[PDB]
Design a binder for these strands. Sequence first.
DNA 1: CGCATGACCTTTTCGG
DNA 2: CCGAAAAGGTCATGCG
Length: 309
Amino acid sequence: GLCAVCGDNAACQHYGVRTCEGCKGFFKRTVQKNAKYVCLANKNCPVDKRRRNRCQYCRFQKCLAVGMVKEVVRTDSLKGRRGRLPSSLISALVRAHVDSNPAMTSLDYSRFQANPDDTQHIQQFYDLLTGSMEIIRGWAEKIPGFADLPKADQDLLFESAFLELFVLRLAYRSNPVEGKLIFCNGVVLHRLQCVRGFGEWIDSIVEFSSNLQNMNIDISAFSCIAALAMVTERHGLKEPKRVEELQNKIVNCLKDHVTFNNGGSKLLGKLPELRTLCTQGLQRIFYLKLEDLVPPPAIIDKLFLDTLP
DNA sequence: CGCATGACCTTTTCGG
DNA sequence: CCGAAAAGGTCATGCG
Ligand SMILES: [Zn+2]
Ligand SMILES: [Zn+2]
């Protein structure tokens, strides 16, 4: 009772996955004809042993997800040759963003200082980072599709994107015009307070924040960008195509929105600057590790090394 | 009817 | 040789 698609009896691998003779036949025939199917719902129909033959579109979407391989189906020179060969979404994305950041009408200025004038300051740095991990995982689990993924792939997607997200969010909620950094827990510090912990990295962060805010990005669009930062292809994914199909929903989600209220980009034109910002982060953690004066805890060390392939 | 379905067939290769 | 794995081939059956 082993079939990755419909859960029927499976006694072999066909086109890459453990599959029943049925889902084998369906996949073969689909690809041989280039056939395209029409969902009469949300593109999420139930597909199990009895219901499989109803929404054809949704069966062939689940086939593709668990890892079945269009390429294995033979054509051209290998046609008819048998045997082994010789060798709303947008609303949820916004809700998830809003429930995970603090009420801007009630921040905390208890520590703020526009002219501050040591191991304690480096500790408070690690605390702001460890604080954001619980919350950014919270955010991720509320992206539609993410908690349906394999627990392995969730953990991989989170560790790969944690630093890219802590920065991107910090950059979108802070007030750079007044040198003001606002964290997830609503604390407020001036760049010059932060320099003790972040290093000169912070100056690079405030510059990004300037650029990003000077594009006046509405919350619906930011809400999608943050999703595309996390839900992306990575080495180690047990089920890539699932992650690929989800990324693809979110993109078309973002397109539909821009070709509506904003008329018929420049942001992704500095999505490379974000990756460069993050390496600058890693340089800082390496410095603190190697100084061995107050050492980053394992979990920090791990998740800064993990913003490379 | 004409067409999808799927249980069960034959074909190919490998390695002991 | 001959079995294991996994490609396409062959229809009888069910559907609308
Ligand atoms: Zn199946
Ligand atoms: Zn469907």
